[PDB]
Design a protein around this nucleic acid. Sequence first.
RNA 1: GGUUGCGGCCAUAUCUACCAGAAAGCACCGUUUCCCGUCCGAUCAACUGUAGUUAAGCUGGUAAGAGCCUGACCGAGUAGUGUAGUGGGUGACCAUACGCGAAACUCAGGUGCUGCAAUCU
RNA 2: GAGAACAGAAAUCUCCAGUAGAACAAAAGGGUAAAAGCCCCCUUGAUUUUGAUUUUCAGUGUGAAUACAAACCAUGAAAGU
Lengths: 182, 413, 261, 263, 169
Amino acid sequence: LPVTVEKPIPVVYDLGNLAAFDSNVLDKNDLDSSNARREEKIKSLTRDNVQLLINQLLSLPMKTTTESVGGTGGQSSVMTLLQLPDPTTDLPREKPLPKAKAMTKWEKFAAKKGIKPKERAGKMIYDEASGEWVPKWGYKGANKKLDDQWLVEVIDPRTLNRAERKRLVKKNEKQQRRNMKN
Amino acid sequence: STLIPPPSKKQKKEAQLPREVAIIFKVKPVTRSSSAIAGHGSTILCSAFAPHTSSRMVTGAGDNTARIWDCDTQTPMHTLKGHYNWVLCVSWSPDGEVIATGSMDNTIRLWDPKSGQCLGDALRGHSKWITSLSWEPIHLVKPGSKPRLASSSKDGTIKIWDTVSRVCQYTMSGHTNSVSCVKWGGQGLLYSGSHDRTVRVWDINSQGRCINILKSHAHWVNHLSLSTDYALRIGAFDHTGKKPSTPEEAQKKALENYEKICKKNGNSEEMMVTASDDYTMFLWNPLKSTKPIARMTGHQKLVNHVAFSPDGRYIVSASFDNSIKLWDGRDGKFISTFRGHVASVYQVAWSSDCRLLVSCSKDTTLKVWDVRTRKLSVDLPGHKDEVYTVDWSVDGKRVCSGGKDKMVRLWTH
Amino acid sequence: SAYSSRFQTPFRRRREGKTDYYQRKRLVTQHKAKYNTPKYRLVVRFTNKDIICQIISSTITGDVVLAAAYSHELPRYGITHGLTNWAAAYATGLLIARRTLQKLGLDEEAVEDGPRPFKVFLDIGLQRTTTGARVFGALKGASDGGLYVPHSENRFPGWDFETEEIDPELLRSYIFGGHVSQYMEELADDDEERFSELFKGYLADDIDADSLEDIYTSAHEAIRADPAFKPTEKKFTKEQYAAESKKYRQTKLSKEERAAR
Amino acid sequence: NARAKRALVKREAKLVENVKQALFIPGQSCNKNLHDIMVDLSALKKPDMKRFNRKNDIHPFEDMSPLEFFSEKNDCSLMVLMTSSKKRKNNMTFIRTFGYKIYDMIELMVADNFKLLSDFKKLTFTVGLKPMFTFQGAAFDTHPVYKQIKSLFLDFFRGESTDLQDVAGLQHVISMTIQGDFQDGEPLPNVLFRVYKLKSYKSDQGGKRLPRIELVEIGPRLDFKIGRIHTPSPDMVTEAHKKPKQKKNVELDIMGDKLGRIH
Amino acid sequence: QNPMRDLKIEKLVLNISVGESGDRLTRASKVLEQLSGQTPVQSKARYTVRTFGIRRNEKIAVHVTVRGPKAEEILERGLKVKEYQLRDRNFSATGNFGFGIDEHIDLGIKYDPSIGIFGMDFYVVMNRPGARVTRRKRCKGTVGNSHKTTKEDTVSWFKQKYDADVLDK
RNA sequence: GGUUGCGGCCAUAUCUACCAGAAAGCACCGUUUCCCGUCCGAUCAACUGUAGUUAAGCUGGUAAGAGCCUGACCGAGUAGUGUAGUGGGUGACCAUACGCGAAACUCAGGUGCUGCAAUCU
RNA sequence: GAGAACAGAAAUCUCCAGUAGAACAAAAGGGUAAAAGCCCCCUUGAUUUUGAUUUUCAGUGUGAAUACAAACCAUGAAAGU
């Protein structure tokens, strides 16, 4: 009836995996397959181990939070959950770490010069001689507006501009494939 | 977001080790919201659960039409009408047979819960907008008679009302300024605050003659309250909610519920408290002495509300410093200071079990504290604007709140 | 014949139209990046002259029901007619909610304080998601019964698609069956023969449109009073039904009767 | 095109890897009872589990290439090929992989005394909860073979490595025990896989809060027999255990202050 | 006996396959609109025809389904142009039939010269009670052969009313 | 033992033509007042159960019916296949062993079981 | 397959048949079945901060990118995505 349990060798604990191990010697007679009682002794041993684990797991500090309505993934304030320590049982990794980084021949030149990373503030930029901003990327682009203008004041020039844009795109793809080669 | 710093690796190595093994009537707290109830297009100014059941409720607002609500269905029920100005306040009779409200206009209108129709011609006489109301306790009332309805106005006059005749049986003008509130105690002596920095106990039994005038506050009194106010308001409606079989049984149950709290110290002497703008509060025993038993103090800004615990063991008051402060109900000694609100508190309502205290503030997120642990229990966000008012059902099954968002909201476990 | 051999058979539950695995997988297969917790589905279904709603929990042996309710129990609560209507669905939802709340002991493992108010993810199955559906009324009744099923108000009856506002008076009239009262009032002055055909029980019982609200209120009070889920008397023994089934069930023919032919 | 990018991100070496998927492979020799034991073991593995109706003639000890191919095609690093033979009856060749390359292999042939989950009390068993583990015997912490079996069962059944867990989710506990102690050089005793449903009751004699624990076996019951085994090469053991790795006289003081020390 | 499986029309479906794209398709749709009393649904080209100059996705035709008692009235109105004499063809083996007619103006409605002359296709579809099982989202299934419609049942229903003859064996 | 809701296995479960379904429970069905959407109240949404039907879907039975599946110490520890010895030969390769270890084929069997709540002469 | 004024072997429309030689960026190739395909409704995101690398020299409690993780976002009734 009492929840107390003890063994000559204290049970090892890994609360992060919710696992426990018992080094105490097993009784070979109780574990024999021929015995009709073999299931009962194993059940009692598993019950004692689960009781020790519950005595350990119940002592762990529990998180609490006041958030209750509109939490995205927070636990309910009525709810309480154990703070599991990170597991002590190391396990093999599923995949090798993605260590195949490459400078792509540009970061080295940037380190060799004063060039700095782009501001990453936003694609939007004000259009000239216009009352509304025209984004340079990710939407209707001012660079493509040159094709839409009614006159170029100069073979169609718009076809030459599209050819230059395709040339820049193919050069970027070629540099990407060249960095893929290394 | 500034997340709590990660535990040090030594703390993790310590946590990995076995630790902290040691072989060696109640109300469910509110914790969740409910669907919003659309209604009159004006900010809610007040709310009050029906004493006999949480399913019924009523709220004032800036709209002239007060709206009773069916909390079980979260839908409007028999919307009130007749007033031509804002419904500054609402209150239910302790017997529950009649509703009462105070409009910003001088007129006052009783209402019948069964249909919501006005109960006769509106009460009139006040020279200024109504400030507060206080129904006469049922235990003082003789059987077979409707309780009298106290009233107050910005002029500072008070007029006891006979609900049957719809006439002011008595009147007084002893306050030179606005009466912030009034309450009908169970001892038969009336008490009320005033804007004149004075309080005056009154004996209704002596034709309304005054008997004492307190004078300790440095600033105008606000929200006068009493330890017995919960029993005087519930009307002998126990949490089970069963109606008494006879009015005499209601009178006996009310006298018993009053004696159970009045004799907590072995003698019938209800405690009294008076909030003030001077960042101070004073306990009062007018029958015992004309001077405060203690000078509660500590708030950094003017208190906005006070509410004795239903058992009377604890005192608590709202404040503009964004920190509710608990106090002992027997001597006013400081206990603990609640914190968490980002803006000035407006009002609070004790739970029927006394183990919790729902609260609200100018911040949109109302909160409720577990007084037993002296710590916040659970936040209740959802209101789109300030939560001007909150109240707890006498049975504790549900909670209601208003605000500037014009969206009444209910809360329950 | 080769087409019969190449094709793989659809799952037998998929072969029936009663279920769609693509939704049940999300209903059961939590990611589950959030901390693991037990969960239960508030299954809901509808059928002719009947309604069904039951709590359910996943298990390796198959779904297990923690509680159940049906429209056929409504008459015991005084709802003798209209069991298929919107208000009857809301009543069945409030009934199942109060029933599970009473069987759970919430009112009327103590560790990890147990009040732990119940919550469930309602599932209409293949029923179409449209505003004003009676299944949404059963969901609103379960929400009003103390069960906490998350839900936006957009699908409740009377919703205005053009604005966030939701009419509550229309929701009350639907919960009380007031739309049936409006249909009866429209039939009263229109072609009477449809009134003689439809609502024949409301006339045989001397029911009237004004009394439907009080009847639904008394039914809600009865649901609040005794949600004990009284078992049917079951007059005949199950063995008697098993014997009656043998008289007509077509048992497989013995091999002696066919191998010779 | 974005949908392919999600599959590529799922097939990537995340610094916090998602729980490994399982892909049982029924064998051409597999008996119907072995298929039932496989479905029973798969039921505990849900939702991260997969199946292939087609029969296969895989010979992992003779040719590992098909297993490495299926592990990449199905994105299931774990595998458990069913197998049976006149000698290796009811064989169950559990497999693991690192990068879809083979990591280790071990035979776990079922004993004839196995019991299906249906032959047990019909107690509720919520899906998706993390099983508890309760290993027994000193050999599990010392014997390399039993250590490998323990690491395999833990990687298979531990589920998500959540940083927080409800007590309500501890509805069941996986259990295993060796068939008695054995002297060094003796044949390995058969493993005894077991499962039990948790139960709780008031204690009154072991603390105000701690409840008395009780167990009710639910299965599946199994008594695996050890057979052929294979182990990762040491370089694989080094690559598979490296931490992501993603300060003296400095510490993060409470409230986030980065207080130093002069000492 | 066949008490519960009496033959009945499922729906009427008028159609007008215009021979060229253009604004004339709008008048062809307005013809069906005035005839059936409901808005025609446009039909985009199924693919790159290229045998008549139309391109893929180009609108080519319009159609509008009809149901209820009114469908029988339009059925008789279209049969009146047909002289109540169907060919032995124009009959689906499943128990459906249809026909078209030139000069739709003859069928009751006023000539309305501005709309212009147009013909219209017709295709009635017989069905029996329990056909809802085929289309219902829940418990979807097939139909038994005894309940299935057949061309003989369609000819019998055609002889059950309008006294139509089967010309051109 | 029949049946409704949720399911587990995922063809012993599916396809073709007929027969039965006593009582109980879907379904077919009748309608467009209201919520609601489609060219069409056909599907969807809603109305009570009213005028009916076991005619269909559906549950069972039949068929030298088509596919499918089970175990046998059935092929069989057989074929295939790594291993040693100059054992024979210029040699390939052949007998001798224990390992891993099939299938076509043959025999016999079957054409769905099973958990929760409820209901039924 | 049976069919539909002009309309036939190729127009658009109808009923019974379909494991899907539909369109899923796809390559060996496993596989998508009330979708990962067709149709319809609502929408930003190159948002903020916490750490470990990146060079800088008013090297800076980040002044700015890379990766980590939390808020915020859109949607649905929700599960979840």
